[PDB]
Each structure stands twice: as C-alpha cells, then as structure tokens.
Symmetry: C2
Subunit: 307 residues, 2 copies
C-alpha cells in the first residue's frame, strides 16, 4: 500500500513518555494544518535521529476539532469520547483539539523534543495539559501488576491498531482513546495480596492468568477481554503508561485501534458491567479524570497540506 502509519502508534514499549494536549486558538486552521504536517514529519524523522534511545511518537487530532481542521473529509467512525457513568464509576469526556504523544528511553531527549514542538506551534495553540509517564519496574502499573500482557505482538499490532482499506483515504491511521486514571494507591495497597489478585484476575508477581473457571466476573481481566458475535477476540493495542507524582498518579490509559468501538465495548463492560450486575471492581481503586477521542492520521494524510 501507499500511506505510512505514524510510528509510535504501534511502537514497542519505552522507559519514558510525554503527553501533550493542545487546544487551538480561533481561526488558526489555515496555518495549523501545514504546521502539523511539519510536526508529524519531525516526529517521524526523529525516530531515526534518536534510534539510540528508541524515540517514537505521533500527533493525533481531537474528534471535536477534526471537522474544523479537515472539513473536506473524516475517518468513517470518528466520534467523541463515549462518556459513561453509574455510581462512583465515571468515565467523563474532556476533549482536546490536539494530542502529541512522545516516547523515548531517554527523558532528556523527550524534554528537548517537547520544547521544540511547542516552539513549533508558535502562537497557534495553547498547551492545556502536560503529563509525563514512565515505565515502573518491569512494565508494571503503580498497582504493582504487570500491564499490557494481553497486548498483540508482531505484525498483528498493525492489524489491530491501524485502519486498513475499509476506509482507504485514512488507511494507516488509528482511533485513539485516552483516559487519565488516578489511582487511589493507599486504598489499593491496603488490600491483602489475594484480594488484589482476585480483583485483577492474575497473580501479582508471576502475572499468571487465572483459570477461566476461577476468574471472578468482577475481575478486570474478565471484564476487559471480550469477544464479538463469533467468539473472536475484540482487541485493542494499549500504549498506556504510569504517570504522575504524589499530588496525583496512576495510569495514562491509551487505546489505539482500527475502530473506536472496541474501546467503547470494553469501557462499557467495566462501568455498566456484564448485564447481570458484575462490573469492574478495579474501578473501586482508581478514577478516570479525563477521557478523549482522537484520530492519529497516517503521515501522508497530514502532509498533503501546505496552506
């Protein structure tokens, strides 16, 4: 095929990340489109320049902003973040016009690049939120359990994450959902090991999946690992990482996917649960403060704009 995916939609894991949310100023579209193409290209080229430290990243566009920037066409299924709630379980929507996702095994390099990208946007946008994520131990969440075990590996990563010829104009791109989960860690780490393990549905140290006959229905793994009409695995490609500091810490949940309703189906099954009353009790211990829908176009889509 023709169009190239932005690297870092599907990159393997890194030690450090930078997450930037910009909102655009008024009537800046004429100038922002090419300015984005610049930044995307910058990010792509940097993968080579900083291969030393596995640099990769991408730029993605807010669902509620897309029509302003690129009014001539859309990704078929692009939709706002699917906010939900019931009881103390909220998944709110806070959308942002632009998302810049930077990953590297060195922090200083990410800092440099972040500055450079900011300086690139000039006075066209405003940084609303910034968060920096990190690998915690051997790819563990601050909860102490391994994250991303169930992620697809190999060429299957692209198969799951990237739009194919089902929407040829946007082939190469990916529907990106993001939730900033704030863990209540003191509440969590007061659970005895087995309660922790029964909540997640795997052993903590060796990260061993429970026999399905033992998986509680309220467990995270039971609740998030799903299957379509035909019992085929409904998959996403998580690029999530721990983030934050004492003031507030947890997991930057980042979903990348061919379709944006693979994420929906899963979020629904956590919040509202299985229809028989069992929801994801992991939500008793963490709070999604934000929820955002983007599309990360292929590099080539972005680049067709001077003007």
């Amino acid at each position: 095929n023709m169009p190239r995916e932005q690297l870092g939609v599907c990159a393997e894991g890194n030690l450090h990340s930078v997450y930037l949310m910009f909102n655009a100023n008024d009537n800046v579209e004429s100038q922002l489109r090419p300015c984005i193409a610049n930044v995307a290209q910058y990010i792509y080229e940097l993968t080579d320049q900083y291969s030393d430290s596995a640099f990769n990243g991408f730029v993605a566009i807010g669902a509620n902003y897309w029509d302003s920037l690129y009014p001539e066409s859309r990704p078929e299924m692009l939709k706002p973040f699917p906010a939900m709630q019931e009881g103390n379980r909220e998944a709110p929507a806070i959308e942002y016009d632009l998302f810049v996702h930077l990953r590297c095994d060195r922090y200083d390099i990410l800092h440099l690049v972040a500055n450079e990208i900011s300086q690139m946007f000039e006075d066209l946008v405003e940084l609303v939120e910034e968060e920096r994520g990190f690998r915690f131990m051997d790819s563990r969440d601050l909860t102490g359990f391994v994250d991303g075990t169930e992620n697809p590996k190999g060429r299957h990563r692209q198969e799951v994450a990237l739009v194919g010829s089902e929407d040829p104009e946007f082939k190469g791109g990916s529907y990106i959902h993001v939730q900033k989960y704030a863990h209540n860690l003191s509440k969590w780490h007061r659970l005895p090991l087995k309660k922790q393990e029964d909540i997640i549905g795997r052993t903590k140290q060796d990260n061993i999946e429970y026999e399905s006959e033992d998986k509680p229905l309220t467990s995270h793994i039971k609740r998030v690992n799903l299957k379509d009409e035909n019992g085929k695995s409904i998959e996403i490609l998580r690029q999530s990482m721990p983030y934050g500091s004492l003031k507030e810490q947890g997991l930057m949940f980042i979903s990348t996917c061919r379709t944006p309703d693979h994420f929906e189906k899963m979020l629904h099954s956590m919040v509202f649960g299985d229809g028989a009353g069992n929801h994801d009790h992991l939500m008793h211990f963490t709070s999604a403060l934000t929820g955002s829908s983007f599309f990360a176009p292929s590099l080539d889509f972005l680049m067709q704009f001077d003007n």
Copy 2:
C-alpha cells in the same frame, strides 16, 4: 570522628531526582522528630538496597522550623534564606519546614521511594511543592551549557560541604540553600552563540573556561567564582539539576556547604554585582521563583529521638 553525614549531600551526579517540600501541621513535633529519624535512616539504607541505580538522598530541616523541632540547640550559623532584590533581579525567600532530596539513576525507583516516604509522614505534614529533576545530556543545564564544572571533587567534597569540628554537635551536617530558577528559554536560545558564551564565561560545546583577561565582569563565571580576604577560593558543592516541563522549566539550584554565607556572598555578587555596577547578566534570562534555607543534619543527630 563519630557522626555520619547523610549520603547524597555529597553524592556524585545522577540521572533523576525528586524534590519534596513539606510543611508541618500544628503541634506535631513530638511525633515528627522520630518519624524523621525513620525517614533519614530509610534513605540511608536505600543507598545499599538500590546501589544498582546509585540511589542516594537526604532530609533537611527548614531554618524557620528548626527551633520548633529541635528547640534544645541549633547549628551555629543557621539563618533564613537571604532574600535580595534590585531591578528585575529578585531572589525571594519562600521557606519550607522540611526538605526531602532523592536521587537515583532510575525514575521508577524514586517514584516508589517518594510514595513510601509520603506514606511514612502519615498526617503529620503536607506536601507543598514537588518537582522532579533530570540530567539533560552530558550534565548540561537547559541553557545548553555544562553545569557543575567548577564543583569540588574527591574527599574535597566533604571538606567543602560538611560541617566539621567547628560546631561539633552538628558535625556531619550541611547548610543547604535552594532556589528554583525558571529559565526563559525562548529568550535565551535567540541569543547568538557568542552572546550566550560571553554571558556565561565559557565556550558552549567544549565548555572551555575563558582566559580571565577575557571574562566579562557581567559573566556568570566571573560573578560566582569568588575568593576570601586571602585570595582563597570561596566554594560550595552544587547538587543542582534541570527540572520542570513546558509550563515552567529551569534549574533547581541546590547549594550544600559548611557555612551558609558562601552561598550568600555569591548570590549577592550576582544581584548587586561587583560594587562597580556589573551584575550577573545570566539573571536576564532566568527567574528565581523560590529560595529556601535548611540544615541537613548528620544521620546520628536525627536519630537521637524517639519521643
């Protein structure tokens, strides 16, 4: 001698740091004293546990809080932060009751430890400020110039930093000053190289010291490298590091020293200058938002309190 310095007052440099400022709640002294001894000891022991990643750190006590915690005696020369100002050049004082300084070549470990220390203080204190620093390239400031070149090395580090038998009760300790400098990086990086270099008094890449005959009097190096009545070098041991994010970034200036007026003399010579009108023009490009005075006692001083 007897008393052991907290490691990390004099540690060699690391890749990552965590800086924590706590203020104490009302009338918590009885319980906080031993609780500190715990945390100091924790930090000391962790140097062994995490020698893999060169972990080190220390706990230091705010000058304005010391008499509350340790009313029975003081370090001879302990004094508040010496606030100064003239023109757009301010060095303000913002004091904090307690300072926890954590360093490691791994970030995840620092995160863990920071959480653990917080959980240790229970409800005795409140985290006021947190900042995380990092090594930027080969020990460079975000300004792009090498930092800490003029630092003492070897056993001389202790000679400079640590109180000796001139105040035997507090031997092993160190007077610690801290300023959070916020760089105006866009203003800085619009200077041509030679203006940058003339401002600092060394070459940028190779970091070559100017011949004294060429050092402008307004240069940082000229202005900070001083000598007593007898032309002997007035020294400190900097443990400074870059910090921050797009919202605000710069240098966490951290001075450690036998006496607290080595730092003063230097800060004075930057702000008010040389008496003939020449001040440190590096201050045209960065702003000290905070300034804090502490003493980091020897481990053994801290530990003499149960109760």
